[PDB]
Design a binder for this molecule. Structure first.
Ligand SMILES: Nc1ncnc2c1ncn2[C@@H]1O[C@H](COP(=O)(O)OP(=O)(O)OP(=O)(O)O)[C@@H](O)[C@H]1O
Ligand SMILES: Nc1ncnc2c1ncn2[C@@H]1O[C@H](COP(=O)(O)OP(=O)(O)OP(=O)(O)O)[C@@H](O)[C@H]1O
Ligand SMILES: Nc1ncnc2c1ncn2[C@@H]1O[C@H](COP(=O)(O)OP(=O)(O)O)[C@@H](O)[C@H]1O
Ligand SMILES: Nc1ncnc2c1ncn2[C@@H]1O[C@H](COP(=O)(O)OP(=O)(O)O)[C@@H](O)[C@H]1O
Lengths: 536, 427
């Protein structure tokens, strides 16, 4: 008759946010049978469920759940096994340990029967103990014995209906098949990364005890914090809050002359939104996706509009991203950029990518696998593409294809594994209701034409060079160098002919020119420009 | 009674300030504001950086600074046994006292410290290393569960140190377990002055040092010189000086008469610099002697032109932004002298760090070895404000016997991608 739930409980009291569906689901397939009047359940001819598995990315609050589910229940305090703590040197004692503590339920069932209080067991990181049978061909084989002991103990000739087991892990692909099946560990559950609304919920939950004592300036607002915080885990948000508190407090302390803390400014303690922002940009750094630093490294000297082609390219990219965002017949898209060397394809790609405002971005550049072998490169590609599938919309910019695969003209000689890997990957649609964009760059179109790759890409874009005196003058004006008189003579000796050069080249030459004396700089520069004389 | 000058670690002010701010702040501010707050205290610190910056000294002194029980030390993989289920027992024994103190007092417990020298030795990425016995993965799991398990702790602080900050498993470096991670790098001129001041304090106290020696010259003349190496130098020169007085070849003898007055002069320091100490991230005079054999003679105009062009490029790299990387190629017919000249240019660039990579020290190697050596040299070069690296006879480094032709591609790819890699922003 006694209720299995504590008379005083609340879903807001436990303090978990953003996992409402998950909490609702388990209860539905778990506690639904233990609260209803027993009579129908006895007429029901049913056995309560035994076993639940929680698997997902690290530090995602997986454990918090176990703690507050143990606390919620109106039953005995559960038993916990902090990983592989049930190993003994003597022969036959691991099995005795694992069998012990599994028999209080047996005793109470054989005593009362059908009226015993629920028992609860916890097996943190089950993966240490339970592993593939026939694997781990090391010595003493104790693990293969213990797994069989467990299997039998939880389900066998003997029946038990008052025990609930819970296990958390980080590698759900290593557990024994049998264990994870009906009757044994059942209703497999997966904890995923949060959305922005979940981030807001977590931030509000963690920022409730400070607003309740007039400790926070009205300047700070949470919507921004939820916006900038991208690819963040609850632990990361808590750490950010802690760092903000620490830096705010530090202002009142004095060091290098022993420890001093004023008790006057103390009473006027306040935290600043700007302080939060500074801490966010300085110390905390997520480990899932890309960060502003990557873009700041790729697009070094920014972007300048020396002509209409750049605007045209940007417009085309905007149209592509909009289509992929809103289109539904075509869950996949791909665009190939082309241009002669030293045109700046990398920077334009990076910029269009950044402008998408997508959740999951990533940049796979050749200079992150120096000296590797073909297999390592393939596995890296596999992992990078694998991560994207677990989101809703994303864009990956593969750069320098003609390097990922090597096309030394001699021969020719080009690895073959990488090529096929890519040619396949670029036609594998993701799981249902998800969207991806694959932006590639190159500098040798004809070779790609020969390799029958040019028909896999959906479309193409062309990036030209600077090929007009007016454009060169505009670029020089924008940069702000060799101006005034200098500019006066340069325009004099250039407009009466045509030019052909890439922006990078121009930058290095301008630099070199300035490094000479101020009595002959223009001469130097103009002289150099002639040396680089060519045309299509 | 503690002060920052007493410790004697000079030149790491910013790092110490940040560590104090991030790890000893909530324990100093009055516990009333902490009660009204929910600032759960941090429980992880990691240190990494090239050898010779004394990561250990830091730890030793910071441990001393505390006033709540001496620390517990683990020396490398000390906690290991052959009986099953024993290393984990040793691991668990570490936290018993803290657990008991927390249970008995709760919020009125003192601080417990744990130090893990060469953490990498035992802690490593899971799922990769061949744990034939399996102790490594088991220990990793045990630590991960104990540090942050269902039960919560608030009075422990772990400091780890390692020169290889990649083999550490990612699961341990999330904000929950280990938050503050710091790099310790080479020192600057001011740091060198600070260190030299410290190491040579008692000596000044007892008038054992001649005024003939100056400290500013010592600081300037020594560049990219690891601090430890500064201490080493001081000690070596001192030893030389004090030996001068002893006169004994076969039968040991001490000339007390000459020992009445003892002082150290510049000459000892100069000799020690020339002969005794040899920096690693510094520059060495041997290579220049081994490459420019018969010197340089001006037999015609072209040489001056070439030298002038070289220094122009040097200037550009030293005094420009927007172009942190510049590369120049020299070529000519064979047996012409297109090797030494590059070394002369490098010696004239006056950069703190210079290095020459040749096929001479790789003969008989295989491809992977050649790629690894190149990567290592450039990785080491990446750690300084300025640098100058020479590659001699790219041809042989790739192998190109004309028949076929026949050459290795892996090396070519490597060198190619390499030449277009930005230095760590700022150098
Ligand atoms: N409008 C612009 N478009 C492109 N790049 C620009 C522009 N304005 C300035 N830049 C600078 O020019 C350079 C663009 O070329 P980048 O350095 O990315 O090499 P790349 O030519 O793409 O490389 P690769 O040789 O691998 O093809 C970057 O420094 C970028 O900051
Ligand atoms: N003015 C000079 N220019 C060049 N070399 C000089 C000059 N004066 C003397 N030498 C000597 O000439 C030799 C240069 O030989 P070096 O190894 O450069 O020839 P190389 O054929 O370019 O080399 P490698 O076969 O490695 O390419 C050295 O002994 C150097 O000291
Ligand atoms: N929904 C959530 N509500 C509150 N805190 C959360 C939530 N999700 C994650 N966290 C934070 O994550 C941390 C718990 O991580 P945990 O799940 O124990 O890591 P692991 O799964 O590796 O054991 C806590 O500090 C907590 O503040
Ligand atoms: N800032 C410093 N000031 C003075 N001496 C220093 C400083 N940093 C390091 N040292 C010296 O360098 C050496 C470092 O030794 P150790 O700590 O064992 O090195 P590591 O931990 O890097 O192997 C010691 O002689 C130490 O006194």
């Amino acid at each position: 008759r006694q209720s299995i739930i504590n008379p005083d409980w609340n879903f807001e009291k436990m303090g978990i946010g953003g996992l409402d569906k998950e909490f609702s689901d388990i209860f539905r397939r778990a506690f639904a049978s233990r609260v209803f009047p027993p009579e129908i359940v006895e007429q029901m001819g049913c056995k309560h469920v035994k076993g639940i598995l929680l698997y997902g990315p690290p530090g995602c609050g997986k454990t918090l759940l176990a703690r507050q589910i143990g606390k919620m229940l109106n039953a005995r305090e559960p038993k916990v096994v902090n990983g592989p703590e049930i190993l003994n040197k003597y022969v036959g004692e691991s099995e005795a340990n694992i069998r012990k503590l599994f028999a209080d339920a047996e005793e109470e069932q054989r005593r009362l029967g059908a009226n015993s209080g629920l028992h609860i067991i916890i097996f943190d990181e089950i993966d240490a103990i339970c592993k593939q049978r026939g694997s781990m061909a090391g010595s003493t084989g104790v693990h293969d014995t213990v797994v069989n002991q467990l299997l039998s103990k939880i389900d066998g000739v003997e029946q038990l209906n008052n025990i609930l087991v819970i296990g958390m892990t980080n590698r759900p692909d290593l557990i024994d098949e049998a264990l994870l099946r009906p009757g044994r560990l059942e209703v497999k559950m997966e904890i995923g990364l949060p959305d922005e609304k979940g981030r807001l919920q977590i931030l509000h939950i963690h920022t409730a005890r400070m607003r309740g004592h007039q400790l926070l300036s009205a300047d700070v607002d949470i919507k921004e914090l939820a916006v900038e915080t991208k690819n963040f885990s609850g632990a990361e948000l808590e750490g950010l809050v802690r760092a903000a508190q620490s830096t705010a407090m530090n202002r009142h302390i004095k060091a290098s002359t022993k420890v001093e803390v004023d008790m006057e400014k103390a009473e006027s303690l306040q935290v600043t939104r700007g302080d939060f922002l500074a801490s966010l940009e300085n110390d905390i750094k997520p480990a899932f996706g890309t960060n502003q630093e990557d873009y700041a490294s790729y697009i070094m000297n920014g972007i300048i509009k020396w002509g209409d082609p750049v605007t045209r390219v940007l417009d085309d990219g905007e149209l592509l991203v909009q289509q992929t965002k809103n289109s539904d017949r075509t869950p996949l898209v791909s665009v190939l950029l082309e241009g002669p060397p030293h045109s700046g394809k990398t920077a334009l790609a990076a910029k269009i990518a950044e402008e998408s405002n997508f959740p999951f971005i990533k940049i796979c550049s050749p200079d992150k696998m120096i000296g590797f072998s073909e297999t390592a490169k393939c596995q890296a590609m596999k992992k990078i593409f694998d991560d994207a599938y677990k989101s809703q919309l994303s864009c990956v910019v593969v750069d320098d294809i003609e390097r990922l695969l090597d096309y030394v003209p001699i021969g020719p000689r080009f690895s073959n594994l990488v090529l096929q890997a890519l040619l396949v990957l670029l036609k594998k649609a993701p799981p249902q209701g998800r969207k991806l964009l694959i932006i590639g760059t190159t500098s040798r179109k004809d070779v790609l034409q020969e390799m029958e790759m040019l028909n896999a890409f959906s479309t193409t874009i062309h990036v030209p060079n600077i090929a007009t005196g007016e454009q060169l003058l505009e670029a020089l004006e924008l940069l702000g160098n060799f101006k005034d008189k200098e500019r006066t003579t340069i325009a004099q000796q250039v407009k009466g002919k045509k030019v052909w050069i890439g922006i990078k080249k121009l930058l290095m030459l301008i630099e070199m020119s300035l490094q000479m004396d101020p009595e002959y700089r223009v001469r130097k520069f103009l002289a150099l420009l002639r040396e680089e004389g060519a045309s299509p």
